[PDB]
């Protein structure tokens, strides 16, 4: 459950992401694949090397979905509807893996937003990513 403060913090921090949205998504994915190799088995048809055009393209999609979630933070289940179905039915993504990607997104944000990544904003982003993860795992 996001507080008014959380939503403010999330909108502000992600607003500072700007044209890097795609790029940061791709980096979070690479961080996940390298730190948590079990996740790689979901992308057997991706080249997961550094600089992979496929990871870059996919990171932009992941970032865009996060942006949709920020833009509609009061009704994320509705907004992420098709994605919930995809990850649970079609892909059958293990819920543990959402925690891994969420952590790597925080690390990426931390690494790129020195000023914005305060303890308060960190807490807000963590809860936001957990709520997103809840929605994406909600149709099992």
């Amino acid at each position: 459950v996001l507080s008014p403060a959380d939503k403010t913090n999330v909108k502000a921090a992600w607003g500072k992401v700007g044209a890097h949205a795609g790029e940061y998504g791709a980096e979070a994915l690479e961080r996940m694949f390298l730190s948590f190799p079990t996740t790689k088995t979901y992308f057997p048809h991706f080249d997961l090397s550094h600089g992979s055009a496929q990871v870059k393209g996919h990171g932009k999609k992941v970032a865009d979905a996060l942006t949709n979630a920020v833009a509609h933070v009061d009704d994320m289940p509705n907004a992420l509807s098709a994605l919930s179905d995809l990850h649970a039915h079609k892909l059958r993504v293990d819920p543990v893996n959402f925690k891994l990607l969420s952590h790597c997104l925080l690390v990426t944000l931390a690494a790129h937003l020195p000023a914005e990544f305060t303890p308060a904003v960190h807490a807000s982003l963590d809860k936001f990513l957990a709520s997103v993860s809840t929605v994406l795992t909600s149709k099992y």
């Binding site: 690390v107 690494a111 303890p119 960190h122």
Partner: protein, 146 residues
């Protein structure tokens, strides 16, 4: 179980730049802010009402340096963390009854703090190396729960 030479290289090179005194207060502070139930173990620390209060709390930085001290110590003994963390394992497990999931969260917070501090220098392979470390420390601390 074992870091590769390149992972060891990543860990030690970065840690030589870490302000041990400061990074400790920061990680503990962020743990208490981000995962508020963890405050239950530090009722003695006084004011923890707001994030600024928590981060600015003398008792939190003092103990965070202690905590990270044990961590900084843990890096000079990466071969057997089990024996290395035994005193702390009994303490945290038998006496404090901290759930081991919290060891995992603290390690991940530490990773976030390192990323914050080092920015671009905290690359994905550098991160991957530290994830093996924080997981090892977490598991070593949890051994007395098994």
């Amino acid at each position: 179980v074992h870091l590769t030479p390149e992972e060891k290289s990543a860990v030690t090179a970065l840690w030589g730049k870490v302000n041990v005194d400061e990074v400790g207060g920061e990680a503990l502070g962020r743990l208490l802010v981000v995962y508020p139930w963890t405050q239950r173990f530090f009722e003695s620390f006084g004011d923890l009402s707001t994030p600024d209060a928590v981060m600015g709390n003398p008792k939190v930085k003092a103990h965070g340096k202690k905590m990270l001290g044990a961590f900084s110590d843990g890096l000079a003994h990466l071969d057997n963390l089990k024996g290395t963390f035994a005193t702390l394992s009994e303490l945290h497990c038998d006496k404090l009854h901290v759930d081991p999931e919290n060891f995992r969260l603290l390690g991940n917070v530490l990773v976030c703090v390192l990323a914050h501090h080092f920015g671009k220098e905290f690359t994905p392979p550098v991160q991957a190396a530290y994830q093996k470390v924080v997981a090892g420390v977490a598991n070593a601390l949890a051994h007395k729960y098994h």
